[PDB]
């Protein structure tokens with residue numbers, strides 16, 4: 181449940 | 192004879208550049224933020240400033256050597272817990288001891304204790320925050336040390352929620368050995384006097400600041416009226 185953070189972290 | 196290896200110099204060079212890619216000492220993007228007012232008058236602007244800065248911190252983190260080998264869950268827990276710390280740390284670059292204020296290029300973007308309390312903080316946070324900024328500024332870190340400290344801060348194995356503590360520890364160890372070795376080979380006396388241990392202590396001050404920060408956030412949160420005024424990255428990261 182951290183889509184923004186997870187999106188900023190992806191390659 | 193402690194020698195700064197090729198790998199350690201590469202590590203340093205990466206983190207310098209990673210910092211240069213994510214800290215704009217022009218402060219140009221600040222016009223994009225909701226504007227500052229000088230009843231929680233600063234909360235919208237500072238929410239935005241912090242939101243922006245979380246983004247930069249995330250970009251810096253991604254370039255830390257070995258960080259991309261973590262699970263994306265571990266990456267997440269490490270940023271959620273360190274973000275506010277890394278922001279207090281990076282902010283040292285704009286903090287000035289003249290005024291004990293953070294000076295980002297113009298009077299609009301110059302932030303003092305009245306502004307911070309105008310976002311809902313008491314001397315509970317502000318007093319140890321300023322003492323932290325003062326003590327860090329007085330270390331006069333080389334930029335090399337500043338960037339290592341930020342990275343060591345992010346890749347801490349003891350953060351709540353950490354799954355693979357061994358991997359986080361192995362990455363941070365390579366960064367601390369790089370820092371320790373750099374101080375030895377490149378930081379002249381007397382500045383270098385117990386500089387490592389002084390740096391680690393700043394990380395303890397940041398943990399305590401983090402704790403206080405959680406309290407005050409959780410308090411500010413329980414009014415939706417205020418939470419409304421934040422950004423969705425801030426809600427996600429600090430909630």
Ligand SMILES: C=C1/C(=C\C=C2/CCC[C@]3(C)[C@@H]([C@H](C)CC#C[C@H](O)[C@]45C[C@H]6C[C@H](C[C@H](C6)C4)C5)CC[C@@H]23)C[C@@H](O)C[C@@H]1O
Pocket residue numbers: 234237238240241244275278279281282283284285286293295302307310404408411421425
């Ligand atoms: C950011 C940075 C800068 C200054 C940092 C400052 C001075 C302004 C006040 C800040 C941002 C301090 C804040 C107010 C401390 C805090 C906090 C809470 O988490 C808070 C309080 C309210 C409501 C939430 C979002 C936002 C405003 C932060 C939670 C900590 C660091 C302080 C400028 C520049 O160097 C970029 C760097 O990246």
